[PDB]
Design a protein around this nucleic acid. Structure first.
Ligand SMILES: Cc1cn([C@H]2C[C@H](O)[C@@H](COP(=O)(O)OP(=O)(O)OP(=O)(O)O)O2)c(=O)[nH]c1=O
Ligand SMILES: [Ca+2]
Ligand SMILES: [Ca+2]
Ligand SMILES: [Ca+2]
Ligand code: NA
Ligand code: NA
Ligand code: NA
Ligand code: NA
Length: 898
DNA sequence: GCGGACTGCTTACC
């Protein structure tokens, strides 16, 4: 097999690489790499090197990386560009791996670990590491084993060994329910003192040195804790064994620390999750995320974690092992490790650089160019500067019965490709008319020869640009995975339907690839399967969809980030002319098709001057279809699904071709390199046939709800609410309020006003019995100190911050009580007037029960009246006025009767 | 007292 790197670092004039050789063994080499950089040279000096602008360069080879760096400074001291890749390990990788890297993930050592530290004096600061590490569990992907390091003897208590027998038993048996599928994978090691544990851990580490190192908060807690504890016990030299090149770097933010372990690639799972999951969670405790991602139960114990080792060491160790397994389970579902390796090897970068789309693209573009013997420009300093973005129509707040939406495929990247926007394809400029002159096809055709954006920029149509070229490569990967996702999703609905009439029999899940639409043979079998087998198939489908979602949405993110990066001053190819070329063209494309679409519908409906498009944001249009439906008459339809089929067809056969024509003309108008504005139907929405449901409503920009029957070719088994912007979607809204508000909306859109009012009456009556956590608001807790004045709210102190201060006063002098962490999230509750806390709200760390010290008092004093009116009624009022309906029966003349 | 204009902060939508 082809070789592939695992890790690369630069240490002085040396490149240290770990790699898998052609016989699949892991090696390590130190290479005294001799890099090249480039200077512009006279045109008379023949060469094979040119900058992206076609100017010739001479290659300078250096004796070592140090001389290359010093020459860069000198060149600045002179005032001349020093071209080429200045990140030498990216050059090294490019030289060394001059081909499409095919990697074998089974050859890559992925380690997942988690440590426990009993601390009586609150949270154990990693920079200090005052307290013994009393457990480590460390899963090795090569061995497929959980290595458990259990401290039996500590100044905080001596305990008996953990029992694997008991670990495996059900909780109802007094066991820990350590998943049976890992019991035989546990390698348990007890120790009679910390020193021996740590030294054994290190010796283990040498033998099985991680390439990818992950876990949950491992970068901000586990790694710096382990590093410093070993450092403070055995000394710096021993601590450095954690690095396969015995080099570490302490990066400090005082007094926190991030340790950099040379030769290892740390991908903290919490950071992968935040960047790639596309969620915003009220809490990021592994407990909370596990329950959310896997539907497993919150782990239970009877005391504070601070005493868990002492009172139930058996459970303490089982829970440490489980914590490690939960991340593996989340990754098996979400697959962010795979994504990282994929992306990393594609760009040819340090795997941890997947967190930086700028580095990722610098690398991809560098390799693409190096390929053609081209030379990349030197990075330059630029001041930060604002610039305009998308257009968003101002909707008329109202209900809207029948709606179909359309959306442009990969919008900004398609503009990049269509127009041919790249640093080196710029041709010149033209004098711009006002934007609406272009939108209205009234302005003078910008250019006859070059491809144009209405911001004034022209680009060459002939030449290929490296930006369009490389963004197209990733776009095509995105498109492949999205197909798998959507097919898996369609399969899913097939399975959900057949689950309505399951055969009462015994059988097994069919062996099928859910990435592709089921064959008619598969469907026939399906409709003969047991419920058991069907539910298992449905699980596998949904898992295939998630896997597809991760792969597609994150390649989407990467290419949109290339768009973004053109407007970041740290990007080698920063250029506000290209950034604006894109967003301005987009503003045009949208408002142009609003016109064409409006024109086309008035026509085929024989109408004149009616506004079909009621909304659009960036690149989408939401079309009111009341009149399309009305031209046929509702009575012409057997059932809901009937007219849904109707609009699917109508949109497919009539509308899209018109839009196709509409954009082809725009392409012509701008003389663009290639027509790539592909706008397909998105959602079909409307009330159930015969129902009094209102179908949909908008409250304003970015705030709407629709009752959807078909989404991008997925015909749902039951209608799905698509709600955007409203409080049901926001992590800051209490859980029970979200659920309640969503049910009000479901009722409005599906059933009608009378339903809504019934539900509201009931909610109002019973809502005081809801668990406090479910009615707590959530907020991020930033700049607590900024607003802390002697324990009390400084000027302009935000509501949630006030609540934190209320908390800190209430727990003052309880070293043990949970502290609110700067930057992390808090639950917030309002308190009734005259409460013992001396303020109107109180806040505590999200994801947690409020400390027993004050919990009872908080519950007594919660302000249910404010909670309800402020978090539930106000939003509800907003929705219903928008839609023209009442959530309470107004007082009327009829009141005078019985 | 407190509405309305502004501001900081938060978290959506693309
Ligand atoms: C979601 C998102 C969009 N955008 C911009 C660029 C997107 O092309 C444009 C439209 O947003 P989207 O329509 O949501 O995404 P998309 O058009 O790029 O790809 P697709 O619709 O096929 O799933 O908004 C960003 O810049 N950053 C983002 O995170
Ligand atoms: Ca001993
Ligand atoms: Ca789009
Ligand atoms: Ca059946
Ligand atoms: Na159980
Ligand atoms: Na869109
Ligand atoms: Na689409
Ligand atoms: Na199409």
């Amino acid at each position: 097999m082809k070789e592939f790197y695992l890790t690369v670092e630069q240490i002085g004039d040396s490149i240290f690489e770990r790699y898998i050789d052609s016989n699949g063994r892991e090696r390590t080499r130190e290479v005294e790499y001799k890099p090249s950089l480039f200077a512009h040279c006279p045109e008379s000096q023949a060469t094979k090197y040119f900058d992206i602008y076609g100017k010739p360069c001479t290659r300078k080879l250096f004796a070592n990386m140090r001389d290359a760096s010093q020459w860069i400074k000198r060149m600045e001291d002179i005032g001349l560009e020093a071209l080429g890749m200045d990140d030498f390990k990216l050059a090294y990788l490019s030289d060394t791996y001059n081909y499409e890297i095919k990697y074998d993930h089974t050859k890559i050592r992925v380690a997942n670990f988690d440590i426990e530290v009993t601390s009586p004096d609150g949270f154990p600061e990693p920079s200090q590491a005052k307290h013994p590490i009393d457990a480590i569990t460390h899963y090795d992907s090569i061995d497929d084993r959980f290595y458990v390091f259990d401290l039996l003897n500590s100044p905080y208590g001596n305990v008996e060994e953990w029992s694997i027998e008991i670990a495996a038993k059900l909780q109802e048996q007094g066991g820990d329910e350590v998943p049976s599928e890992i019991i035989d994978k546990i390698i348990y090691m007890p120790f009679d003192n910390e020193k021996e544990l740590l030294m054994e851990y290190l010796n283990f580490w040498q033998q099985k040195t991680p390439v990818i190192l992950t876990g949950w908060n491992v970068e901000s807690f586990a790694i710096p804790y382990v590093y410093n504890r070993i450092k403070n016990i055995f000394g710096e030299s021993t601590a450095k064994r954690l690095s396969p090149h015995r080099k570490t770097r302490v990066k400090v933010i005082e007094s926190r620390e991030i340790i950099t372990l040379f030769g290892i690639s740390v991908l903290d799972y919490i950071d992968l999750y935040k960047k790639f999951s596309f969620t915003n969670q009220p809490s990021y405790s592994l407990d909370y995320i596990s329950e959310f991602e896997l539907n497993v139960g919150k782990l239970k114990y009877d005391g504070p974690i601070s005493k868990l080792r002492e009172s139930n060491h058996q459970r303490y160790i089982s829970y440490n092992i489980i914590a490690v397994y939960r991340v593996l389970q989340i990754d098996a579902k979400r697959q962010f490790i795979n994504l990282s390796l994929d992306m990393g090897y594609y760009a040819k970068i340090q795997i941890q650089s997947v967190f930086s789309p700028i580095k990722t693209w610098d690398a991809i573009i560098f390799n693409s160019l190096k390929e053609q013997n081209k030379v990349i420009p030197q990075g330059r300093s630029h001041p930060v500067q604002p610039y305009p973005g998308a257009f968003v129509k101002e909707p008329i707040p109202n209900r809207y019965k029948y709606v179909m939406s359309f959306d442009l495929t990969s919008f900004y990247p398609s503009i990049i490709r269509q127009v041919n926007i790249s640093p080196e394809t710029i041709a010149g400029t033209f004098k711009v008319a006002p934007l609406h002159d272009y939108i209205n096809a009234v302005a003078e055709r910008p250019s006859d020869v070059y491809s144009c954006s209405p911001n004034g920029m022209m680009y060459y149509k002939d030449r290929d640009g490296v930006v369009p070229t490389e963004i197209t490569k990733v776009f095509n990967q995105r498109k492949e995975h999205k197909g798998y996702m959507l097919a898996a999703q369609r399969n899913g609905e097939i399975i959900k339907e057949a689950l309505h009439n399951p055969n009462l029999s015994v059988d097994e899940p069919l062996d099928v690839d859910y990435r592709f639409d089921f064959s008619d043979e598969i469907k026939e079998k399906i409709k003969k399967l047991s419920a058991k087998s069907l539910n298992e198939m449905l699980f596998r489908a949904q898992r295939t969809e998630v896997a597809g979602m991760t792969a597609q949405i994150n390649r989407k993110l990467l290419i949109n980030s290339l768009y973004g990066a053109l407007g970041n001053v740290w990007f080698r190819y920063y250029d506000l002319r290209n950034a604006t070329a894109i967003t301005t063209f987009g503003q045009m494309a949208l408002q142009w098709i609003e016109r064409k679409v409006n024109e086309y519908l008035n026509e085929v409906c024989g109408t004149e001057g009616e506004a079909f498009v009621l909304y659009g944001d960036t690149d989408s249009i939401y079309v009111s279809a009341d009149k399309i439906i009305d031209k046929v008459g509702e009575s012409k339809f057997r059932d809901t699904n009937h007219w849904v089929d109707f609009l699917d067809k109508f949109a497919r056969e009539r509308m899209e071709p018109a839009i196709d024509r509409g954009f082809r003309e725009m392409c012509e108008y701008m003389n663009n390199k290639q027509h790539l504005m592909f706008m397909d139907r998105e959602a079909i929405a409307g009330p159930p046939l015969g129902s009094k449901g209102i179908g949909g409503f908008w409250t304003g920009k970015k705030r709407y709800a629709l009752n959807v029957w078909d989404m991008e070719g997925t015909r749902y088994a039951e209608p799905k609410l698509k709600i955007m912007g409203l409080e049901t979607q926001k992590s800051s809204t209490p859980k029970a309020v979200q659920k309640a508000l969503k049910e009000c909306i479901r009722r409005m859109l599906q059933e009608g006003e009378e339903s809504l009012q019934e539900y509201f009456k009931e909610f109002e009556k019973e809502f005081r019995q809801l668990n406090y956590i479910s009615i707590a608001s959530v907020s991020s807790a930033n700049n607590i100190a900024k607003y802390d004045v002697g324990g009390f709210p400084g000027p302009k102190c935000p509501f949630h911050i006030r609540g934190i201060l209320t908390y800190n006063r209430a727990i003052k002098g309880n070293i043990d009580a949970p502290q609110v962490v700067e930057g992390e999230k808090v639950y917030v509750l309002p308190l009734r007037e005259g409460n013992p806390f001396g303020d109107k709200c109180i806040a505590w760390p999200s994801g947690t029960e409020i400390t027993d010290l004050i919990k009872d008092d908080v519950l007594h004093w919660m302000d249910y009246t404010v909670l309800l009116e402020k978090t539930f009624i106000k939003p509800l009022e907003g929705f219903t006025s928008a839609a023209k309906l009442d959530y309470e029966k107004k007082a009327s003349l009829f009141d005078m009767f019985d």
